[PDB]
Design a protein around this nucleic acid. Sequence first.
DNA 1: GAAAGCGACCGCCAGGGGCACATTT
DNA 2: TTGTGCCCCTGGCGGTCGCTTTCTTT
Lengths: 325, 313, 322, 323, 92, 92
Amino acid sequence: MSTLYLTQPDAVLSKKHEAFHVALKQEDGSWKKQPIPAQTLEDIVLLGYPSITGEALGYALELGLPVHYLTQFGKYVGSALPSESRNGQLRLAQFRAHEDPIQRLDIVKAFVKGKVHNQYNLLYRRGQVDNPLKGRGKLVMRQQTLEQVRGIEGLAAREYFASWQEMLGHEWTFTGRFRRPPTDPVNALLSFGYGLLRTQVTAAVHIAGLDPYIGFLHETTRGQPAMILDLMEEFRALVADSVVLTVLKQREIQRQDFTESLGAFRLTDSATKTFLGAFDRKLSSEFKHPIFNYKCTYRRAIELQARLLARHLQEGVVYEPLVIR
Amino acid sequence: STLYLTQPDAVLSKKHEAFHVALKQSWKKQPIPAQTLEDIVLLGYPSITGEALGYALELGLPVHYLTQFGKYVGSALPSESRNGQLRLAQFRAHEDPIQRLDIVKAFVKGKVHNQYNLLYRRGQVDNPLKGRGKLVMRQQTLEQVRGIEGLAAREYFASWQEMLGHEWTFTGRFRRPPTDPVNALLSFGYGLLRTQVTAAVHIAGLDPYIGFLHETTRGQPAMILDLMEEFRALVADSVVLTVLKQREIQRQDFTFRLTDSATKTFLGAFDRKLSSEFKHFNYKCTYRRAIELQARLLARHLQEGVVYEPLVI
Amino acid sequence: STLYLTQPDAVLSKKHEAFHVALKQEDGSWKKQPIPAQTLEDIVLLGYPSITGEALGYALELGLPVHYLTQFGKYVGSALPSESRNGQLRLAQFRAHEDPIQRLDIVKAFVKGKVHNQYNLLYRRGQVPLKGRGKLVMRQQTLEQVRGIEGLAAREYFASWQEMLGHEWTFTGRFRRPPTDPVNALLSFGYGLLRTQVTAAVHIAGLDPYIGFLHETTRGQPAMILDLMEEFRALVADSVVLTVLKQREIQRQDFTESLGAFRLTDSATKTFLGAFDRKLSSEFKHPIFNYKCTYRRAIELQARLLARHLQEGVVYEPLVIR
Amino acid sequence: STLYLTQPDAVLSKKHEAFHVALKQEDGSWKKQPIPAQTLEDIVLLGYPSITGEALGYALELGLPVHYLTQFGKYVGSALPSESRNGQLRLAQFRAHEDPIQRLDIVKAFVKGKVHNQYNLLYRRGQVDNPLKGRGKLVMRQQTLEQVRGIEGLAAREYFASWQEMLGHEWTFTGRFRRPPTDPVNALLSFGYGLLRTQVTAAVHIAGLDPYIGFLHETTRGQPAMILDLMEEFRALVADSVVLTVLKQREIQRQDFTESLGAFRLTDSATKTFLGAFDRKLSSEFKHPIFNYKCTYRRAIELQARLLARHLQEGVVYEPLVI
Amino acid sequence: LYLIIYDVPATKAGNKRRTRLFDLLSGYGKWRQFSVFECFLSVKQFAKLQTAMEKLIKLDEDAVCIYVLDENTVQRTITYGTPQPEKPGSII
Amino acid sequence: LYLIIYDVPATKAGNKRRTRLFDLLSGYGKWRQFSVFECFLSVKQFAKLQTAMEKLIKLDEDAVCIYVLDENTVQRTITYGTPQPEKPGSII
DNA sequence: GAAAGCGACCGCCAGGGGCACATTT
DNA sequence: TTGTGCCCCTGGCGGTCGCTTTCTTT
């Protein structure tokens, strides 16, 4: 629904009585203060830390326009979210069922039961003969402790990442994924994708009133949110992952990268503006919703899963996550 | 250890690995180093260089936008920050009557001792309560306590007849509808404090719509209405009596609305009061800041177990 | 679509592809107004207003006839667009007029199409004379009898009207040119500007107005219209006055000046024409289809049906209503 | 008996009961000429004058047509009244189309007129005075249609083949080729016959005839046969003559366009100066036979159409206008 | 209705075309606003206008726009100051 | 998809209404012609905008119409010197 | 008299230049 | 180096009032 993106790190977003005015030119004229409609937006994403007005944040939040903050590369740094919800009873459930392990299990065993099948039902489409995650899926439910499941999610992540070189091609090398900064060239791009997936997932939690910091998979003992990731996890294979090989196949094969100050293979300006296009294109894909015939864009799918989990925490709904073959 | 900006005539920047607060309309640069800070508070409506809004977010520091009066508009939060244990302890406490009750006693002690010290300020006759503060501590459940604040409220309000005179009537406290001029001035002030408290809450990370004393319903910002008690007698109930001696007379009140001219002189007393305090450990303070403090001390009462003794005079 | 115009001091000038009509209300008195061509289907001039000669050269190239009329609504004449080129048609229209064995078999239908509509209008408005007369036409053997029959049914139609009009007016005897009564003059109104929509339809079907079938053409009046106007004389010319007299223009109007004349006032023309377009802008469902053949179309449709009747030997089923 | 107005600047108006013309300018204080009713049963606004509606309203209440034309005579419209005796006129126009005696005795008139104007023309352009010598009465002594059309189509050939002698060298001629003209001369002729067509058409519309019902030219293909029947006795004198006149001081090869698709078109200049003669030629005719003096070709067309209206309505004679 | 919009420059070679197009649209429809005409017409009468347009406009410096509202999507239109859409028989 | 026009006099107390109506519609939609905006948007945006538009006009002196054009009717807006309507998200 | 062809006084359209402002159950 | 109005006056639109040349065409 008409998301906004800014990438010139010298601009200004001023306000005119109902709307925004962006300014770029930077003294080759009169700054080229071009108009922009604000009441039709749903979100704002910033990459270069552009100077925004102070009087405009308030208006963006009087409407429901969350502000985000990323870096040139695309790494996540923070966000300014709007008025929060009121169903604190929900959040109390989010927790009341967070410290009873016998429930936290039955929930994460769905989060992953709908995360490995979502990987295999992407590979089989890509053309992987076996790449056997179908087994890990069946071996989830057997498990009966969270420490017996986090290991499986990591193992499956590595089984899903070790099956990359044969999928990508001979051009780029993806031997493994590193926790340290983007040493691997292809891995500098998922931090973009997996970075600006939180842009659309750190607000769907704020729409259902879910407390971001209390989750079911990630131990909330490091200042890291738990719902923002735990929930962002299912959608790391299908909205922030299929984007990558969708664009790394038709587009940006190479010649649009750089390297400096650590090696640190980076991306390039004038290629981002194509990446973000790919992202808004993937978000606005319809996909017909394999539960009923919803036929809803992913952009909603997230905002839905949030409320479905909330109702699960209030109305005892069944948590049927997403899977597409 | 927080960086405030009370003037929209300022500019923030990142100049060579450290903050630079260009203030005085160009006039009064004064660089500041990082790694001592834990929070920033842009009180007015400044302009701020995005180059700084990264060096503060990739570091572990939020940025809270407000307005010169203290109303809460928005906050920029980082990805990595330790507010999880805080929320968790807060909930563990809401469902643990030990912590909840020993904290509710703090709020009630604060309220009643502030009321008594107000009637000492105005020196009513020195017969308002005389010992309500400790009686609460001598309780061991909630109902007992919750039944003491209302008794103290009637004792504290009915004593205003001799305090004010005949120029302004008063018998009790009536919320919406105000039903009288002074009850309406109260509602307005009692509420205007809600904004400073809402900010002070989001600054510390607490969840306003989940609290300890005021049970949560209709999205009642219980975490606000709790922190509001200890001030209901020290800011608003003092401001009203500070202007009801000189300026505001029955003229200014319709019928029970208020005229636009009073909605601006009331603030000449409100903000003015909010720019002064002594302490008590002597500490420079302005009533506005003490609210952020009490919130941080509550967060530390839940995280570190620090004692939370409320504010008194 | 159709455009009626009243004020006789209105110069109707022609601008690039429209007409500007000039009205005069007292401030300096040249107040003008644009008016679009390309959307009209015919013009009607009630008074005797002005026409810029170079404007006929525009209205006669889009199919817009210029029908001249009088304050009272008494038809006088018209100007028409490019003529028709179906001479082969106007030959049959004539050889069937001099073959009386054919002319009689046509007038029988022209009347069967009127008497049925009369009796059905009566049952439509509440009544029940004309039941056993539509059948005493096809059993004739000549024409003079048929003309006497039409006169009979008409002197019964105009004197059987009283039972439905009301006490407000009275109808006893009828004269054609002199407007003795108001209604007897509202007929001169309707009977005049029904030819406006007929005389153009015939022009479209390449028919000749002068060559007659029922009316004998040796009077100087077009004997094709005054035979075709008969079928709708009782539908649009009549049913409009009887539905504009239902709480409209009952009295308080119709100045009685010039004894022997019942002229309308203003504000009654501008309403009578609105009700007229109500009639010629509605649908009656026409047995052929569930919904078809707008009223104004029906006339052009009848004209082309008669053309086919004279070249393709088709039936000529007049328009019967229930 | 006909209120003509060839000037475009005139205005008619009713002065207390009767028409009143104001020629050549302003309604106020310039060039009045009053004229009554009681001889007026036809009003002809040749150009594009203005007229006050109060005049027509009068006219249309007594059977007075208003024929709007162009300053050249082209027909653009007619305002006809309700009461008009054009019924018997049409009935006779048809009763003659379906009675070969009338049709034939009228076709003989047209043929006689055309060939007579042709003979009197070839002596008018004194050539040798031996073109045909006597094809006129050869028609009248026949009693058929086919034997008259043969005479028409043979006199046409024996008449057009007598031209190259009379034009000379710079222009070639072999015969009459209708549209598309294979020659320049056929182009001028097919273009002049159309102007004569406009004038006739106007006459046929005033007279009240049905232009699409004819006597000689069979009515089919939507042909204005009643116009051609009246053209036949004017082509030789107004069109076939104007062409001869301009090709001896005026237009020469320089003008007519090249063979685009073979048809020889005219220039943007001659099409305006050609009327230099095609407007004076129809402003003439001092009536050779001492019958009368005052007349014009442009008006003789209206006349002949009315004389036919009378030949049918009133059993009058119809003599073609010769020389 | 068929809503027509023209916004042509203020140059004395375009003002000719703007006023000429105004005089045209005043022949097919009703003037609604300074640069908005409401033409209610069929296709026989719309081609006669589009052919009169393509022969008139310089689309390298002109600015035109058209909207095709059919009857049952005009009932929905809202107005505040000007009258309602109507295309009946006209009288004066 | 919605479409908005306005016609306002040049009174100093009315020109403010225009220069505020543009500064309003900018936040609520796009721009094609001088007195015209084309605003593709939802309904509650309308209940927030209409309630602002009724809220700043006197009817004795201003003119505005509101044309509603949902997808099927928008498709054909044949033009010659302008791009036709649409409304995506934007990258800068 | 009538059409179309120009060449200027005033009701609609916007960006640009300064200089009063700023608190809120 | 942060909005919200309230002036002038420079400026690309929008249409009417008032003025010299046209008129004739298979």
